[PDB]
Design a protein around this ligand. Structure first.
Ligand SMILES: Nc1ncnc2c1ncn2[C@@H]1O[C@H](COP(=O)(O)OP(=O)(O)O)[C@@H](O)[C@H]1O
Ligand SMILES: Nc1ncnc2c1ncn2[C@@H]1O[C@H](COP(=O)(O)OP(=O)(O)O)[C@@H](O)[C@H]1O
Ligand SMILES: Nc1ncnc2c1ncn2[C@@H]1O[C@H](COP(=O)(O)OP(=O)(O)O)[C@@H](O)[C@H]1O
Ligand SMILES: [Mg+2]
Ligand SMILES: [Mg+2]
Lengths: 475, 462, 469
């Protein structure tokens, strides 16, 4: 029941007694600060402290709770900013809820699932067309700093507006004023009222960074097991991994590659497998995961990147070269993968995207001939003209996610050759005015894609685009 | 039997103290009753002294308490074997995870054991006829051999695995085992249903060591599948198949266990027992006098470096490679096996005949020449090629289409019924194309057929 | 009997209490029959490395002294037998009945105990015997990538010693047991097994047995050397042994260095291969020839372990991967392969005929990656390449080799097409064996080349009967 502290240092306390304590049990110090039993040793209990430790000393007493760590869950957390313990940080009162869930919770088994068949639209043309994410899938967003990782997750969250999908943005190890900037961006785009924000900033103790993704996962699981659909973002697991390394090294567990312990893979695999697509018997709900990894100088073969790449169902690789050139979002399509693939797309997108991935592969493969202008044969001439125009369609502005019906028409137009006549610099303006024309006048073609999930009459669609093309003025 | 107390719990490691003179052997399964229901199994690893045994956990250690009773089972992790395992999905401990009722096997065998003795082993290489033209001709599998399976996402890896299970079961009467080392739970569910739909479920026992299990579980799961494959070889004399996906994740698990036990790392951060662990797994996969286990193994290559200790140690045991290419799948050439990149140790006049080797090398030389001229043809044109090359290009295109084949498992995709083509028919078919007997036939005739007679039969319909 | 008790054990390394009078490096036996090695004698305890399966050894398990320094059985009882590093039979043909034993660790011959290597050890392989000739008592490294023909050179060398009164020892370290079973069957079919000892420590065998395997095979070869006879030892391979010794050293927490190997990894191989030698007339005149294997990664001869063994042996035979997978077998790299003994290991006829053959082919391969004068050398080069190509498990007598090399180097195959050279060789030797047997027999008896004029006529006589494509 009760035990006394032997030694204290660096957010860690070793405790005498507590003979019947569980591994992972919640503990309470005499001043009200909480702790978690990580190491059970022969003569002491290694406890990680979930708060300040300056008032914890030798002779300080610790109490058993007899419980694992739980968090508040449900509709009350929507629109709120919380820490990993579920305590509010936004300064907008308490979180009234009867529903609670454990931080550590087992993932759905092999028989509890159904194949991922439902789209989770990011609203980003490059991702939705060629690297499609499905409901229940785990898709890694990976790349160096300032490549556009966070923006992709925020634009995905904004695009869920009016789609009945609860979003969860987990911030781990970030500057707290940067997190304050993120919630303001969600507020301005009307995205916050269906979003839960879990933040464990850089000044927080290491156990809260370690526990932040699991806390956010539990909040997403509530909606999954109730039959609804949810999205969780871990931004990022690199800083979470480093926080768990800190605690393991302080508890003197043996170091390996980059000083990480032997259970750091187990850490992330246990987290990410809880994201799933449930079967009809289990209610049919889902949790989609978007884990982040911050690589260093493009080193995808570093240890923590290697772990999370293999665990997930696919990777959206971002790169600095593309970002600086103006290809934004800076998605490397060649190496990026989605193992779910066509199953996560509607029939309209699946049909148009086949030519898009073919055309874009041949362009960047035959880009050595690009400087040699007008010396080439007409076969490779038109493919370069087509290729550079499709790149301009795959470019997209910040915080402007496109509906799937508008994406497929834009991809249909460029791939079938309706923008070959228009110059390269006017392709993005041609897109914006075309979709404005289609929304106002030819809404029946758009509404067909919304309702059926298929392309309308192709010759009717060709006629609609050609009417606009005559009204357009190049430059 | 021996009973002990938990003295330490440190992540997936558990130290258990036993009474004097009655300790568990190394690699023994030790069961611990959980306070909140269920049973944790741990594996004995090190004898530290003072009658204390350090153990590696096969499941989560959360909820454990110091002082709980731990029972020595008296043997390693013992798993069910025989026909009761067929059509079922298992974990590392040999327990069913498919929720499909009881597994009524007669025997349970330990997953830890020595490799077969020198006197038991086969003394000569024998081909394992898969019935797949491209594999049998150009990169044939050996009985008791190990094959490296390479290929990207969505190129026909799972379809090829299912066809090998079907063909060996149908013609040779050899059953199969699938070992998912670091299996993604979503993909394990898909693979189960995919094997149900194709019908090869009944010829295969499945074992998953899932991604979200501890390093100890993923380390020993290949041994569980291996033990099931060994029963059918040793007892029923079968030429068994053993699929291991991914063999790197077996090595990865060993490195993780080694780090937990506190061993000094070796080169490139790998465990010092790298070769020993790989060898003790791989040597059990072999051809005996009674039967064999042939293993198709998916291999991840870290940093695309084949000199890295993990793939380098794995390649020491491989007898062949099946390299799937995406460009062939895009052309419609299924199975999408790269006929130049795929290789085999047993492609020689000693193992297969003199004719087989001559025809196989002729196919390679023709396809290599066609591959070299792709840049010349694309720019300069067909008139640039000499009269010798024009004929080689024509035969290479016929050869490339005759290497394709309709699969029993892929009847839904192709539409046509599947074909098993014997080695003699495969050798004869490609021989006749190289000799120039079928130069006047159209190229569509050679596409998606079994024997050379079916190509001639298709020509009249075109 | 003097007893001890195990107090700690893990990864096949034990700490034993008792064994008060035990020697350093003594053979020990546990309760269940498994053997052990007393490595370190500590103040109160003994460090014991288990030399076998350790899944029945634990704290409380008992172990006894044998009173013997780490040793193996030796002599004619092991001929035609398959054993492990302890000398225990694996073939299942009953026990090794022998009174003679020799220690695992044993001193090399001194400075005055040796004599310069002057006696041929014929491999029966044209490329090796002509360009990189091996002598009795020499140490010649066989080095190259995976599947470049290393084991085949050793087995064909062993097969070629039939009727030459040379005992052979094939030490398999860390290989697949399938291949060792295949090797012994190949030796049975070619009647090479009855003078051959097979020591094997497979990949499933624990690391200390891989570590000990070469020294056990060395001891078995040494027995015959010091009694006046000649022996051949093959270590296939020392890269597996080095890696196995690294495991043992890392388990013992000894400080690692380059590629995580311990500081005595050079000494591992250096003391092994020093024991291979050519003894003097005073010491009986016997010899032990060593063919250690090293398996490189991507042809990297400059790596730590390859450079260690190059620094020990008397030259090396590098096997090129690009040549091996383009028809050229055996794939001997003429540029960097060399025999230190050289001409002293060849008979007079082979030395004279193939005197500059290595540098001529080294020049040819340089000119290939690039006139009328140099065109003649390219045409001659292509034809000499076809002669040095050779099928596996088909050794050639030295008298037949010198005739074949004499013909191609003096220009008797220039008018013949390149594709017909292999058939030209085969049919020329049938003509030479059947009809002109006195020319071949002159080389067998004396060692010197026959009459130049008489041999030239015999070749020209055959060329009239030959028909090209
Ligand atoms: N599609 C885009 N177009 C223009 N600017 C962008 C786009 N995506 C991101 N940015 C900008 O580039 C920067 C990229 O940083 P960020 O999105 O935080 O990625 P990371 O999280 O990898 O640093 C941000 O300041 C953002 O405003
Ligand atoms: N033998 C085949 N014949 C026809 N189509 C095939 C064949 N193999 C694969 N495919 C096609 O490729 C797709 C992916 O196959 P799959 O085995 O799932 O690849 P992977 O396991 O590499 O993801 C299948 O859905 C099918 O359409
Ligand atoms: N001279 C040769 N001619 C034909 N085949 C050969 C020759 N030498 C070796 N081989 C074959 O090539 C393969 C590789 O030879 P091997 O000695 O096993 O190489 P390593 O031991 O270096 O792996 C074997 O299958 C062997 O049968
Ligand atoms: Mg960011
Ligand atoms: Mg070999």
């Amino acid at each position: 029941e009760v035990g006394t502290v032997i030694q204290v240092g660096d957010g860690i306390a070793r405790v005498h007694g507590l003979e019947k304590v569980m591994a992972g049990e919640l503990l309470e110090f005499e001043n009200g600060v909480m702790g978690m039993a990580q190491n059970l040793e022969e003569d002491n209990v290694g406890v990680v402290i979930l708060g300040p430790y300056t008032e914890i000393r030798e002779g300080t007493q610790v109490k058993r709770t007899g419980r694992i760590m739980e968090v508040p869950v449900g509709e009350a957390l929507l629109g709120r900013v919380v820490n990993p313990l579920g305590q509010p940080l936004d300064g907008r009162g308490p979180i009234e809820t009867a529903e609670y869930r454990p931080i550590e919770s087992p993932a759905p088994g092999v028989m509890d699932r159904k194949s991922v068949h439902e789209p989770l639209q990011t609203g980003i043309k490059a991702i939705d067309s060629m690297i499609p994410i499905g409901r229940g899938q785990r898709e890694l967003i990976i790349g160096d700093r300032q490549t556009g990782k966070t923006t992709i997750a925020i634009d995905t969250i904004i695009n869920q507006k009016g789609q009945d999908v609860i979003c969860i943005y987990v911030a781990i190890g970030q500057k707290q004023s940067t997190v304050a900037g993120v919630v303001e961006t969600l507020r301005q785009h009307d995205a916050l009222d269906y979003t839960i924000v879990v933040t464990a900033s850089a000044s927080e103790p290491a156990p809260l960074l370690y526990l932040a993704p699991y806390a956010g996962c539990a909040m997403g699981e509530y909606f999954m097991y109730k039959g609804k659909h949810a999205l969780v973002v871990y931004d990022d697991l690199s800083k979470q991994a480093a926080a768990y390394r800190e605690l393991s090294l302080l508890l003197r567990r043996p170091p390996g590659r980059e000083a990480y312990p032997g259970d750091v893979f187990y850490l992330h695999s246990r987290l990410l497998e809880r994201a799933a697509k449930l079967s009809d018997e289990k209610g049919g709900g889902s949790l989609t995961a978007l884990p982040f990894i911050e690589t260093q100088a493009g080193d995808v073969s570093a240890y923590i990147p290697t772990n999370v790449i293999s665990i997930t169902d696919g990777q959206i690789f971002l790169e600095s070269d593309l970002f600086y050139s103006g290809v934004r979002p800076a998605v490397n399509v060649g190496i990026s993968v989605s193992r779910v693939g066509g199953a996560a797309q509607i029939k309209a997108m699946k049909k148009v995207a086949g030519t898009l991935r073919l055309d874009l592969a041949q362009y960047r493969e035959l880009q050595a001939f690009a400087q040699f202008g007008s010396d080439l044969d007409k076969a490779t001439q038109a493919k370069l003209n087509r290729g550079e125009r499709t790149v301009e369609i795959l470019k997209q502005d910040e915080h402007k996610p496109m509906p799937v019906e508008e994406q497929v028409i834009s991809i249909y137009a460029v791939t079938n050759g309706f923008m070959d006549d228009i110059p390269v610099e006017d392709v993005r303006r041609f897109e914006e005015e075309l979709l404005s024309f289609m929304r106002a006048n030819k809404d029946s073609l758009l509404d067909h894609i919304r309702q059926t999930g298929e392309l309308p009459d192709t010759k009717e669609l060709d006629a609609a685009i050609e009417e606009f093309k005559k009204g357009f003025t190049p430059s | 039997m021996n009973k002990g107390r938990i003295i330490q719990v440190m992540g997936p490691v558990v130290d258990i103290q036993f009474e004097s003179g009655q300790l568990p052997d190394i690699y023994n399964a030790i069961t611990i009753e959980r306070p909140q229901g269920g049973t944790l199994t741990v594996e004995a690893a090190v004898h530290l002294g003072d009658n204390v045994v350090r153990c590696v956990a096969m499941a989560s250690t959360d909820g454990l308490v110091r002082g709980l009773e731990a029972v020595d089972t008296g043997a390693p992790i013992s798993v069910p074997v025989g026909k009761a395992t067929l059509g079922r999905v298992f974990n590392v401990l040999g327990e069913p995870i498919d929720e499909q009722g009881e597994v009524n096997a007669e025997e349970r065998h330990p997953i830890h054991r020595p490799a077969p003795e020198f006197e038991e082993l086969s003394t000569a290489d024998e081909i394992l006829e898969t019935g797949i033209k491209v594999i049998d001709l150009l990169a044939p599998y050996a009985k008791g051999g190990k094959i490296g399976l390479f290929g990207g996402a969505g190129v026909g890896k799972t379809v090829l695995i299912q066809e090998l299970i079907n063909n060996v079961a149908q013609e040779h009467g050899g059953l199969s085992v699938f070992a998912g080392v670091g299996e993604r739970t979503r993909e394990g569910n898909d693979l189960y249903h995919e094997m149900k739909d194709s019908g090869v479920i009944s010829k295969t026992s499945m074992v998953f060591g899932q991604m979200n299990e501890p390093p100890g579980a993923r380390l020993r799961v290949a041994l569980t599948g291996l033990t099931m494959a060994e029963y059918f070889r040793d007892r029923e004399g079968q030429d068994v198949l053993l699929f291991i996906d991914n063999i790197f994740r077996f090595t990865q698990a060993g490195s993780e266990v080694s780090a937990l036990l506190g061993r000094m790392p070796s080169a490139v951060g790998y465990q010092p027992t790298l070769a020993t662990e790989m060898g003790q797994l791989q040597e059990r996969i072999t051809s005996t006098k009674k039967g064999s286990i042939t293993s198709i193994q998916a291999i991840y290559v870290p940093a695309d470096d084949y000199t890295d200790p993990a793939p380098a140690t794995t390649f020491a045991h491989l007898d062949a490679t099946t390299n799937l290419e995406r460009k062939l799948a895009e052309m419609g050439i299924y199975p999408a096996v790269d006929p130049l990149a795929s290789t085999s140790r047993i492609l020689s006049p000693a193992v297969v005949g003199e004719e087989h080797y001559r025809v196989a090398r002729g196919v390679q030389q023709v396809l290599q020449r066609y591959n070299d001229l792709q840049d010349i043809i694309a720019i300069l044109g067909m008139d640039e090629l000499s009269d010798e090359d024009k004929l080689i290009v024509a035969r290479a295109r016929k050869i490339q289409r005759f290497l394709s084949q309709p699969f029993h498992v892929a009847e839904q995709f192709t539409g046509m019924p599947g074909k098993y083509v014997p080695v003699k028919e495969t050798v004869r078919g490609f021989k006749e194309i190289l000799e120039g007997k079928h130069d006047n036939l159209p190229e569509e005739a050679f596409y998606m057929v079994g024997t050379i007679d079916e190509a001639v039969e298709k020509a009249k319909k075109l």
